[PDB]
Amino acid sequence: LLKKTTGLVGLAVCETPHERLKILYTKILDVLGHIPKNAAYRKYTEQITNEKLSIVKAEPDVKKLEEQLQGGQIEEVILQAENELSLARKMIQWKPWEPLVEEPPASQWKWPI
Amino acid sequence: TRPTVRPRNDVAHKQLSAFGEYVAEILPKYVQQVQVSCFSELEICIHPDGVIPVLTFLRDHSNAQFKSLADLTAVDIPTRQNRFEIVYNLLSLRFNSRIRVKTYTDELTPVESSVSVYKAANWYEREIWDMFGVFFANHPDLRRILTDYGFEGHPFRKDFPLSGYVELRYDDEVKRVVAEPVELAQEFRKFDLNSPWEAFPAYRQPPE
Amino acid sequence: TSVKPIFSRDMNEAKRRVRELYRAWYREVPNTVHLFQLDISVKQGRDKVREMFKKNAHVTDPRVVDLLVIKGKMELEETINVWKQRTHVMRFFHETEAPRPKDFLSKFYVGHDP
Amino acid sequence: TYKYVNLREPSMDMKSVTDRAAQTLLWTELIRGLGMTLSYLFREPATINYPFEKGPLSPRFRGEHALRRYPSGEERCIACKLCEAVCPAQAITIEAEPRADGSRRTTRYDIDMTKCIYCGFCQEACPVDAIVEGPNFEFSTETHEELLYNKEKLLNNGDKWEAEIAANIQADYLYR
Amino acid sequence: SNLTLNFGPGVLRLVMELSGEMVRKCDPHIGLLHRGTEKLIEYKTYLQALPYFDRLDYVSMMCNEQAYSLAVEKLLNIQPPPRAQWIRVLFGEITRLLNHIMAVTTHALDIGAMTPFFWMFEEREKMFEFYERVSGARMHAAYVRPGGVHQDLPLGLMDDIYEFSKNFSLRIDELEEMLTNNRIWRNRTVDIGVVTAEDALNYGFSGVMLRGSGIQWDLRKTQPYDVYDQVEFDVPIGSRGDCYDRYLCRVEEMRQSIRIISQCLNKMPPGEIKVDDAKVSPPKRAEMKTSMESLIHHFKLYTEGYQVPPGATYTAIEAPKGEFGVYLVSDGSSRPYRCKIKAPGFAHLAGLDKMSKGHMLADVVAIIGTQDIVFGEVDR
Amino acid sequence: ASATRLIQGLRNWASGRDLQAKLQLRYQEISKRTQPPPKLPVGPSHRLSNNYYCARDGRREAMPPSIVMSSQSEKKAVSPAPPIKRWELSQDEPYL
Amino acid sequence: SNLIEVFVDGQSVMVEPGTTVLQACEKVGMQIPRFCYHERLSVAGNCRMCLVEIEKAPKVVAACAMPVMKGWNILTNSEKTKKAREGVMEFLLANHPLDCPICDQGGECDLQDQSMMFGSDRSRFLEGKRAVEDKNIGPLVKTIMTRCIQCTRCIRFASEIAGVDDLGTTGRGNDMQVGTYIEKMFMSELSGNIIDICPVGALTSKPYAFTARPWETRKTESIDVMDAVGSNIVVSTRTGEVMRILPRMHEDINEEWISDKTR
Amino acid sequence: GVRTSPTGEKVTHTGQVYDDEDYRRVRFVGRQKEVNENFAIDLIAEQPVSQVGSRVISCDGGGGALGHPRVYINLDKETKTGTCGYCGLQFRQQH
Amino acid sequence: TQLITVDEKLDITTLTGVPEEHIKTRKARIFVPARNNMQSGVNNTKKWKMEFDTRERWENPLMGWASTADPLSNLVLTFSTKEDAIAFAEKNGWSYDVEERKVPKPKSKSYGANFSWNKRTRVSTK
Ligand SMILES: CCCCCCCCCCCCCCCCCC(=O)OC[C@H](COP(=O)([O-])OCC[N+](C)(C)C)OC(=O)CCCCCCCCCCCCCCCCC
Ligand code: SF4
Ligand code: SF4
Ligand code: SF4
Ligand code: SF4
Ligand code: FES
Ligand SMILES: [K+]
Ligand SMILES: [Zn+2]
């Protein structure tokens, strides 16, 4: 129907939201395959990305895709997919599935003192 | 317990406990404690090396989306060897939720600045420099924001006194506002208000 | 005993940063006396800079002298940019403050302070 | 549950384009603003004639402090120091002793009116309605220490304003 | 090279780096009203700490009272009575009218439109009469307290609030006649201070500063407090993120505040106004002077104060300037261990440097107007 | 209220509104400055029986925060709450 | 060892045989409310504020007097313990005078404090109160006996520590009055400690009377020099002026008492 | 019941007067020492002793909730009257 | 490596902004506060406190108020253990003195001892 505005300032209307979400979700899965399988970030993000990708592949309509992705406008769903891709690329470098780097001191989180 | 007692929200308590488990198992490298208060607020107590990886997670993960930095706070607790408790209050508008991320430092260990995650932090941790003396590494313009320009000390430290060490007056000899050691015409009257009877048995600490 | 540094790995890099901060203050003192139109000399302001550096001369911790260099750079940034007024520059010179009793006997005469 | 301020697309027929061109060239909204200013020119202004006319106040009004008495001349203050305990500014300084008939009475009741935040926590903490924050607000001074009230000043304020203070308390004590 | 203008000492210091007419850098120096409020709070009881909140956003007094009261009541695990909650929502929206009159009319006064200032401050004087009739003070009421409100409404106050509210929309209409369609007012606001939605979220903006950019967020709707889920109102949403849509959002929030005030006047319930836990709220003076327990509780609440159970909350409201938060830490005693005050104007004035880039020097006073900045809450 | 009808008509024409119906100056329509005395109600804890304070003690039902994780399968990924419901446009006045 | 195992709120603790319920709860850091119990006086068991539930026992026990049996689970925070405390506090405050603003005990009053902590927040007493004739026991102890809650710490102190046997209870029932029954002057060398151990404002310091108030006093821990005992004291000052002298607990010197010269 | 020191300075109801050699009298030079001349210790002595036929009397200071907390005064001593600790009104059992 | 080894004593006195007179002439006192003997409650004897030596309080010439020139006259710090207080005092260059915690020793209480057959611990009244 070619939505005129997203309503959010600085968030332009995406012309082809379905193909853009398919590209972003397969790119998230490609980046996310470089994480070990036992990492919870990989399991959880593959789970939610496969759910969103199946919803995108199942719905031709743009408005109904917005109501069942449940993330607002379709352009901020695209923006969140970009943020998840950037996050996964950072999580490869951080490697935060590793064990805890240091225990806190024994009364560090004791409240009240 | 209906009229005068605050009603407990068990649904939000269960949801925030599940999301705290979620954050603790996605990021076990930095998460030290996860707790949910009885009024249903989630606290993620982390190691200070994970200021940037945890906050970037909560900002960017599709199940978190904590896009708003509501507040950034230090708390001085002098009985801890890491006396400063750095507190991040985050708002997810997508999931209509708030989270608290807590870490710690002493006087000499720098905390990594989170301006690359939230630009909102730019003044807040700058305030934490001014009020508490916590240095933030890789901050763009870290300097004082609230105290006077030549101010010595960090006022919100609990060993800093209520009235300071200096006070100002106009001196007409030097034609200038001058700083002198503080003398009060009336001393602030310290009130010892604490009852010697225990108020809350649920918060009783185990004895020695 | 393994702590995280601020800028300096040891005391030599720390003394390097102290030394560069002293160079910058030494260069800045004549401009500070000029544009704040101070009633002190350049020699007197440089003596005050030397006094403030020698006051902290006993410190052997690299993180503490890193924070001292950071705070000295903040004071210098507040001086070069006209963020301080003349009053803040002259607060280093405690001119309206009467000299404190130094020896035992005059402190005995004036009051109870040790 | 939300509305869009400023999401109107203007009509592009020749009627509306000519309307906007006439507004641009003939200054129509400017004449509208001049009409509204001219409309207030012919209204009666809201100006009261101070000091002959006064701004309206309630009997709850928090003004100048006063120490009150019983209807026998005995002062109400029994030196309990609740008002200085609750005083958020620590504006109240109290010293007390038994006086010559053994009564628990103050020897010092100071209110620094320049520390005072005029919030009335002292009059609501007072168990005997001794300290009140009365109705006077016209007590500006020429010197700072004239606003450092001792017990004699506060008892004279009570004796000065009691005919008004008692009637204001009479109008409001059932809300307290 | 480029010009450096030090606009010296609400009160604000500004360090401008200008390149002719354009603004290259805006450095706001603050702390000119830093009073160390939240260090003073640590040496006072919770009741004693309450009047500091009147003096932070000093055009939004009872809203900050409400935020601090909600924080303390959350840590105390008690709830106010329903009439207290309706009085808090009524006076919170009266307070919102006060703040948006202050915001819009001083923002017009700083641009040059000086007359609707004088028109709307008489309405503001009548609302200060409402504060004075309910508490005894025109501005710093100390009225909304942890546990409810201090004192019940005097008889005849709701009729006068009705008589104010019945006429106030015409005052908004003539303000809007002076400014909204005025081409001079539009030239000073329409392309000025454009904030994208993502930058407004990232820079910690809240309130109208989000809603002017199209972000559908209002804490009275999303995270509702006292009885805001029982009142019906709309949330004005901007479309261009500029000074003009934020102006229109504040005008329409005055409209919706009048709507909420009508609903509060019609739905005010009977009952008590403090929580009937006398270990938190002080008893009535007639029973204080009659009952032994009531006198003991009066004594201890006005000298020690109530003990708050240990813990930390972040309690936020939709104040008229945005999200007003208290991060309150109790150690178990009757005094706050820590009270961090989150003000909207702090992050808004931090975002002033991005908002002023590419604009003129006369646009900066308009951007400092559209960010509703009171330096009491900015500096604490 | 004391304005003559010529000035009143000029004023209503210049504003474009009926100004006498909604005057910004207050008159006899406001409440009396002397009111009858109130009789304020009491709360729910003003009872002579079944009113033990331990059955209504709010501060003593506050608990320490439940430690979810401490450092001393195919489970579903969770969010801190369900996603926020999309706001509906105003039926009252959408400006559409 | 012959230690027996008891339970305070489920927590195990090993106590000596003959340990009371109150002392067993003290070993896990729980202070049971009390008025007549004092750990340096003999056990009276008559204020009934220490009543606590032992589980699987359908009657509260006086924790100051009851020895623990092996295997008791002491329920310090259960519902009927709290109801017992609220009922006993209600009876203590039924006839107690509304004197807290004019009473010197206010702010440092056990009755005020554990009325706040363990009692109800309001009154059901719709009657007139008793009023007791004041006694004259000397120039040191001001006596306002309407405030007396009849805990008999007076009498046990004067009998057991001061060795005087001049205080007692005359009468019977609600008319039972603590006093000397005659115009007799209680002037021991240790007579000022009944000001300390009186939990209420019935026995106050006549020199300290009306002058200060405990929240505004600064507490300086110091030493007596009035003799060679070296009694540990608190000098309580206010705005740079010495208000009074209280004892400090030193178990090996002055256990928690001071002489009247010291005081 | 105000009186006057030999310096000419009025003595307050507390009993405060500066000494003759005290410099702080200079604050009243050209100005006045504000004293209240309604001494409460003299005005409560002017009240007559209330003769009542009860053994215990109650006083709230008059006005109900406008007075002080209601206290109960024993009147068993016939040597001394029973004085209210708040308002200073004194009572006597008439038998 | 990203961690350095500092074997020096922890000293932050040059960073706290405290003037030298209120570092080297003050005596911090580290102590568990004594129980107010007006009351039997012991909840104020649970934590360690750090206070400083009381300096001069004099009479204000105008009002008679207590004037002070001591900035540290109201500074009372709370610590969970003695060692935390000692570490905080040594970190700030404060010369300190520590009083040990005085606990009340366990008493032997027997209500039956009030009514003994042959001991002096009989009460003469009850
Ligand atoms: C003796 C009395 C003298 C004064 C008379 C007026 C008194 C009252 C004045 C009240 C207002 C004062 C406001 C002060 C500020 C003014 C600002 C302002 O208006 O700026 C000017 C504004 C500026 O408009 P703007 O820039 O705001 O509007 C946007 C315009 N675009 C989109 C193009 C960028 O208007 C003008 O420039 C108009 C100039 C005057 C034109 C006069 C009418 C000419 C009509 C000719 C006939 C046309 C017929 C159609 C075509 C066919 C022709 C054959
Ligand atoms: S009004 Fe408030 S600040 Fe003023 S004396 Fe009373 S309690 Fe203190
Ligand atoms: S609260 Fe009232 S009675 Fe108590 S000291 Fe203050 S003024 Fe006097
Ligand atoms: S003894 Fe305690 S409860 Fe009784 S009047 Fe005195 S302070 Fe109040
Ligand atoms: S006067 Fe005090 S110590 Fe003596 S029995 Fe009565 S309440 Fe107990
Ligand atoms: S304490 Fe056991 S009954 Fe008094
Ligand atoms: K006593
Ligand atoms: Zn009386």
Side-chain angles (χ1 to χ4, degrees), chain D residues 65 83 86-89 91-92 111 116-122 133:
Chain D
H65 290 272
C83 60
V86 79
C87 184
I92 302 171
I111 296 175
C116 174
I117 75 173
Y118 294 88
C119 73
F121 288 0
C122 52
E133 193 170 354

Side-chain angles (χ1 to χ4, degrees), chain C residues 11-12 14 20 22 33 39 41 78 104 114:
Chain C
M11 286 299 293
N12 294 115
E20 290 294 327
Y22 182 78
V33 171
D39 295 327
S41 66
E78 292 168 354
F104 181 82

Side-chain angles (χ1 to χ4, degrees), chain G residues 145 148-154 178 197-200 202-203:
Chain G
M145 282 293 106
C148 175
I149 62 167
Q150 292 88 24
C151 76
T152 71
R153 283 182 179 178
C154 279
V178 176
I197 58 165
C198 184
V200 296
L203 301 174

